[PDB]
Amino acid sequence: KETAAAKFERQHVDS
Amino acid sequence: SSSNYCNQMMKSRNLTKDRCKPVNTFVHESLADVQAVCSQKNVACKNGQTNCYQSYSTMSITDCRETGSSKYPNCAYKTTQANKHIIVACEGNPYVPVHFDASV
Chain A, 1-15: which have a CB under 8 Å from a chain B CB?
Answer: 4-5, 7-15
Q: Specify whether B99 is catalytic.
A: yes
Q: With an 8 Å Cβ cutoff, are A8 and B99 in contact? A: yes
CATH code where residue B25 lies: 3.10.130.10
The rounded distance, in Å, linking the Cα atoms of B48 and B83 is 25
Q: B9: alpha, beta or left, given left = phi > 0 and alpha = psi -120 to 50?
A: alpha
The rounded distance, in Å, linking the Cα atoms of B49 and B1 is 36
Domain count, chain B: 1
Identity of residue A1 = K
C-beta separation of B87 from B103 below 8 A: yes
- The answer for residues whose C-beta is within 8 angstroms of residue B40's C-beta and 6 or more apart is B53, B54, B55, B56
Cα atoms found within 13 Å of the Cα of residue B17, Cβ hemisphere only: 6
* Nearest residue of chain B to residue A3 (CA atoms): B98
The candidate with the shortest Cα–Cα distance to B52, out of B86, B1, B82, is B86
- The answer for residues whose C-beta is within 8 angstroms of residue A1's C-beta and 6 or more apart is none
Domain range enclosing B7: 1-104
Quoted resolution (Å): 1.8
C-beta separation of B82 from B101 below 8 A: no
